[PDB]
Amino acid sequence: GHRPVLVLSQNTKRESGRKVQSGNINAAKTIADIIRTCLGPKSMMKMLLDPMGGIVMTNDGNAILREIQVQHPAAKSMIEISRTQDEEVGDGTTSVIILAGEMLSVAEHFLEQQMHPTVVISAYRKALDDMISTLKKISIPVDISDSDMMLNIINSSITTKAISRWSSLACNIALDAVKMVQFEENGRKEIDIKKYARVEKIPGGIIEDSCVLRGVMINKDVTHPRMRRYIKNPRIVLLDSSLEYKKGESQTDIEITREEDFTRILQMEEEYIQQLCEDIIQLKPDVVITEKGISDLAQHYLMRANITAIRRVRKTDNNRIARACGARIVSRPEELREDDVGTGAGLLEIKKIGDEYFTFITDCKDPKACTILLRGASKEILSEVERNLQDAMQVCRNVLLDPQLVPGGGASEMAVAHALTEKSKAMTGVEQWPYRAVAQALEVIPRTLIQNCGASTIRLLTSLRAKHTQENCETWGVNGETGTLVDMKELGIWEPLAVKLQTYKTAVETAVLLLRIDDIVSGHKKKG
Amino acid sequence: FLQQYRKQRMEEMRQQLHKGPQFKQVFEISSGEGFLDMIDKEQKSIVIMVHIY
Amino acid sequence: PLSVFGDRSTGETIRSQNVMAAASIANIVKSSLGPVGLDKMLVDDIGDVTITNDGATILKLLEVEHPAAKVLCELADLQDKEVGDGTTSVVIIAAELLKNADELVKQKIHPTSVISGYRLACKEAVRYINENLIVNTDELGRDCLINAAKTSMSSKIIGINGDFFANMVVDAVLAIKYTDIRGQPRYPVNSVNILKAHGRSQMESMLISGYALNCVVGSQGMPKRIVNAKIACLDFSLQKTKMKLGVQVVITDPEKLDQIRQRESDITKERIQKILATGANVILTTGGIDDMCLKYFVEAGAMAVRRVLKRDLKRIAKASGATILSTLANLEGEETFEAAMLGQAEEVVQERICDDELILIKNTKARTSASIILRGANDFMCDEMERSLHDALCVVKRVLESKSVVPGGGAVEAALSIYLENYATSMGSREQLAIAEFARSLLVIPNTLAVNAAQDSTDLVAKLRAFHNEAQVNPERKNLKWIGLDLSNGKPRDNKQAGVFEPTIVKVKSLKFATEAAITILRIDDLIKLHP
Numbered sequence A: 001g002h003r004p005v006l007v008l009s010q011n012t013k014r015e016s017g018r019k020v021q022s023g024n025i026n027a028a029k030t031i032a033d034i035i036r037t038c039l040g041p042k043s044m045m046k047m048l049l050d051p052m053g054g055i056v057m058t059n060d061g062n063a064i065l066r067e068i069q070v071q072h073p074a075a076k077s078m079i080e081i082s083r084t085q086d087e088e089v090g091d092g093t094t095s096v097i098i099l100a101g102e103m104l105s106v107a108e109h110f111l112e113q114q115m116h117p118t119v120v121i122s123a124y125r126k127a128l129d130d131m132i133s134t135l136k137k138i139s140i141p142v143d144i145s146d147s148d149m150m151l152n153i154i155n156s157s158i159t160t161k162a163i164s165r166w167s168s169l170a171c172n173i174a175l176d177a178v179k180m181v182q183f184e185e186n187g188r189k190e191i192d193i194k195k196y197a198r199v200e201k202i203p204g205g206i207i208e209d210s211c212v213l214r215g216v217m218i219n220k221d222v223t224h225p226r227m228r229r230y231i232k233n234p235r236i237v238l239l240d241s242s243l244e245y246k247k248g249e250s251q252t253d254i255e256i257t258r259e260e261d262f263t264r265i266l267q268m269e270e271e272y273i274q275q276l277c278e279d280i281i282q283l284k285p286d287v288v289i290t291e292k293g294i295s296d297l298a299q300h301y302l303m304r305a306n307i308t309a310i311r312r313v314r315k316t317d318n319n320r321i322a323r324a325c326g327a328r329i330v331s332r333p334e335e336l337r338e339d340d341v342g343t344g345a346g347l348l349e350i351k352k353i354g355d356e357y358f359t360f361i362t363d364c365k366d367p368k369a370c371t372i373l374l375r376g377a378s379k380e381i382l383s384e385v386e387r388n389l390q391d392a393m394q395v396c397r398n399v400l401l402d403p404q405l406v407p408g409g410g411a412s413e414m415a416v417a418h419a420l421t422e423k424s425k426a427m428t429g430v431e432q433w434p435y436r437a438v439a440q441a442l443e444v445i446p447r448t449l450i451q452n453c454g455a456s457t458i459r460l461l462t463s464l465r466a467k468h469t470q471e472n473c474e475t476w477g478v479n480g481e482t483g484t485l486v487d488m489k490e491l492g493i494w495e496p497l498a499v500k501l502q503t504y505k506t507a508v509e510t511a512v513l514l515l516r517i518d519d520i521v522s523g524h525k526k527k528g
Numbered sequence B: 001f002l003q004q005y006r007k008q009r010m011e012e013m014r015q016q017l018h019k020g021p022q023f024k025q026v027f028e029i030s031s032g033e034g035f036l037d038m039i040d041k042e043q044k045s046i047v048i049m050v051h052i053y
Numbered sequence C: 001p002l003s004v005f006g007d008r009s010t011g012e013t014i015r016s017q018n019v020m021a022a023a024s025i026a027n028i029v030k031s032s033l034g035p036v037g038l039d040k041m042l043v044d045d046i047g048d049v050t051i052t053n054d055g056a057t058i059l060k061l062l063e064v065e066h067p068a069a070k071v072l073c074e075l076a077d078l079q080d081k082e083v084g085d086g087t088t089s090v091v092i093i094a095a096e097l098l099k100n101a102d103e104l105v106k107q108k109i110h111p112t113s114v115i116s117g118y119r120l121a122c123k124e125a126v127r128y129i130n131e132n133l134i135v136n137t138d139e140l141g142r143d144c145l146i147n148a149a150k151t152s153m154s155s156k157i158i159g160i161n162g163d164f165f166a167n168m169v170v171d172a173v174l175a176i177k178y179t180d181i182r183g184q185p186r187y188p189v190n191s192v193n194i195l196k197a198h199g200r201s202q203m204e205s206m207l208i209s210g211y212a213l214n215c216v217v218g219s220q221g222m223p224k225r226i227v228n229a230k231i232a233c234l235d236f237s238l239q240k241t242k243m244k245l246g247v248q249v250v251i252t253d254p255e256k257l258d259q260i261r262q263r264e265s266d267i268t269k270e271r272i273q274k275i276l277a278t279g280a281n282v283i284l285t286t287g288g289i290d291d292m293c294l295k296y297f298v299e300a301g302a303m304a305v306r307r308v309l310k311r312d313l314k315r316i317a318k319a320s321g322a323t324i325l326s327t328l329a330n331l332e333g334e335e336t337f338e339a340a341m342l343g344q345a346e347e348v349v350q351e352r353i354c355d356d357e358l359i360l361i362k363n364t365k366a367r368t369s370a371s372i373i374l375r376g377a378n379d380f381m382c383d384e385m386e387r388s389l390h391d392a393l394c395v396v397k398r399v400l401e402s403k404s405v406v407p408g409g410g411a412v413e414a415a416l417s418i419y420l421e422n423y424a425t426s427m428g429s430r431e432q433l434a435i436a437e438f439a440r441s442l443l444v445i446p447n448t449l450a451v452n453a454a455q456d457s458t459d460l461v462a463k464l465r466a467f468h469n470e471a472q473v474n475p476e477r478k479n480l481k482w483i484g485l486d487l488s489n490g491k492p493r494d495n496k497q498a499g500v501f502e503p504t505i506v507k508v509k510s511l512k513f514a515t516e517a518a519i520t521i522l523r524i525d526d527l528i529k530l531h532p
């Protein structure tokens, strides 16, 4: 048809200049303002409606941000920052977004004037280095062997979540899970909360009945009623290969001419099943767990040896059982060895919860994996409880790997801001203004805590700044429940240094990344 | 009672806990020629599902 | 009269159209030049976001329709392929050359005369660069490579952290040095595996003294760390044996079926038994490994990795001294594995990186390898980090291969402009005008640099030209050839002393490619656009 001469495509949109920078900064500010009120011990929860019909009720920043679909690429960058913070340290997700928004605001203040973004970026990087130095300076060590202090750290981590009502139970569950899943092999230490330390939520009951199991629990039942549903000291054998006759890999058509060959073939199928079962029985086990199917004839031959069999178990669940009971998964039954038999599980029991059967292996001696059994009001309540427990376990692992500890309640923010402000007095350049501005941008955390508590922001923040101008007041923060100044070595709110370092680094680098853009091109085909 | 598909519930479970990054949105075709050259182009051995709504 | 089903544009109309297209392509990326340039953030139709400063990436992601604009985009791609740096500069120079050539043509100067003048100017500029503006890196030492990396990484997301990233780049490039035949050292960049993982700050990016694998162990029962690794690299899968299409199994006596089915896996069992019996600790294969073989490796207490990339496996094998085996077949018709096929490394570890795990092969023997793990705030920032890191690696490779460098900051452009303006008066009468326009168009680089910093471009360029004219005229002022632009303070500066260096190949190739593209576009004076 009509042909208009064009360089780029019709659907290609390009904008540049101060408009792009202002749009990016306001997008980041809006993203921060979305979750501004979900920070602190007095945070309010939010209902998120899934596009799939689900409901998410949470005050965690990452879930709220991941449930929101946005068009502006700056908001997408902010959501990616939230996800990065969640994946790296598992805490501080709400704080990093607010910090990035405040830093971008104070940067926009300078970009309105005739200051180039590169100068602001260099000042921001200098400030970030100084913040890291100050945070490492004001940190204090912790004794990992002290269970009380670890429980206190986990509590101060979870005081801002809905699970804070059952603080002691949640802290004990998280500490026990992290401690027992901790592993050491070949000179390489690991925690691996992701693979092991599985959280299983069964709606109903009371949350005070939730506990961490000394072993693994799965939603499975015996393959046949004659199986024993209660074994005192079981010997467990784990497999992946099916216990049933299966076709080979190659095309293996038979040609039957004699009369008895058909019955002979069926008899050898049965004999092969019997041989596999006898090879299993030779180790004299009590429980056989398979990731794949178990034939009925195999069940009968296992019963002849009084062996309980469970089939169709997930690979992750089977690995967890192997870690818990100290067994090794074996593919070919004829290659079973004595050390592959799992001895160490002190009880196996299949009990009925509600209208379902659940398999419990919950008396292991020194188990390296666990199931956190969560019981509660409903599915959404248990999902929020699981998220809070995940936060607690992440904080526990962070403390275990890095025993440095940092005062909370905004005390660290004010201390770092004061140190950077004092340091900025001896530079006498053009970068001192952005340096000081991004230093004072850290005060958005105590300000947010005061705002959420409902107290007077200006008076309390001025008093806190005046206190931090003194000679030893690095641990003075705000009480987020009463809206009063308090020493954090008395209140007891402390946070891992790793979380604070990650939060500051991520916020500063988000500001730096969003400050480097002045041109936006959109609408072009993906071309691939 | 295997037909009742107890496994459907856990299928929904890990479909809900599927991934970490953003889940993206369904691509929307705005022009008839867009649909025509979307189906005409792209690799032949790849299934394309279109939802009229 | 023609009766051609299409549109026809002839003469000044098509010439102006081509110049407009080239100028639009240039103006797209002119804002991303020099240390005071700023990145661009591109969004696809499916919402994918790319934040980049590289000209080649921008022009590749853009969807372009005009043929001259396509020529400029392919010019940027070619400059990226053959040099790796100066992708924006070549596009800007080519567009400015085309614009000035069209301005000359509009004055009834024949395009052939302009093309001849452009060719003469390019040849003389290359000769003058090679004879006057090059600096030998032998007297500069290792600091020359650091300075070149710093100059390359300016305007990038890793510019401020250049003090760290330049050392990382130089160490990575020096770790892969080798000498081929003729005794010429070679630096095979793209052999440095780059892994991107969001998480900690930029300054905590790691340079691995070995190789980094984006893979994990096949089974959870395998150890995650082996001290004295004996790496075996295989190019075949370890699964249950299956006969080919030409072989069929037909059973007439039933008693043979069980033996057939047993051998069907005993074959792979025997192969793995040989491989483990030679003493190997780490097994890497490009093919898959099924559960039975994984359990064999688990019982052996060895690390097995499946679906390893072919390039990664080749790099690991040659760094560790191993040999890729696509089959365990020797020249005697048997099935053997020898210890001489085993590579060695000081450690093989599966480490955790931001809630994910990757495999590090540390300190491979008989050859030094290098890998870089980039840490950033999110995926887009890591991608830009990788692009900038690749640019720096290419720049360092060019500097190390050819030991000549030229001052940056537009010093070369100003010197060439002055010299060619002087030289045009000695050649022809209209090619004189063409060479003068070539010299004038070479000044678009310092002009754009000054404009990006909001500095007085006119005054700074005038001062630079005065300095270079004094250098060329006065015989004892030859030290002024290094006077470039200091964009931080907006003043001329001796860039050779300041450490703003570029490889000579970047400037030479950019000049040649831009001249050829400008000549190609200037060769058109009629366009027939056939209707589809």
Ligand SMILES: Nc1ncnc2c1ncn2[C@@H]1O[C@H](COP(=O)(O)OP(=O)(O)O)[C@@H](O)[C@H]1O
Pocket: A038, A039, A040, A041, A043, A060, A061, A091, A092, A093, A094, A095, A096, A156, A157, A159, A160, A408, A409, A410, A449, A478, A479, A480, A481, A493
């Ligand atoms: N009892 C308390 N008094 C004052 N501040 C607190 C208290 N408990 C927690 N905080 C502060 O609240 C912040 C935690 O808020 P939270 O909702 O966890 O956000 P994020 O998930 O981003 O960490 C911490 O920085 C801590 O300093």
Ligand SMILES: Nc1ncnc2c1ncn2[C@@H]1O[C@H](COP(=O)(O)OP(=O)(O)O)[C@@H](O)[C@H]1O
Pocket: C032, C033, C034, C035, C053, C054, C055, C084, C085, C086, C087, C088, C089, C090, C150, C151, C152, C154, C155, C407, C408, C409, C410, C445, C449, C485, C486, C487, C500, C502
């Ligand atoms: N530190 C510096 N000071 C002054 N000029 C610089 C500096 N670093 C780079 N430049 C100049 O900026 C110009 C643009 O480089 P850049 O656009 O980043 O590379 P490319 O052209 O490969 O994209 C180069 O020609 C170089 O001479």
Ligand SMILES: [Mg+2]
Pocket: A091, A092, A157, A160, A391
């Ligand atoms: Mg928290």
Ligand SMILES: [Mg+2]
Pocket: C085, C086, C087, C152, C391
């Ligand atoms: Mg460059």
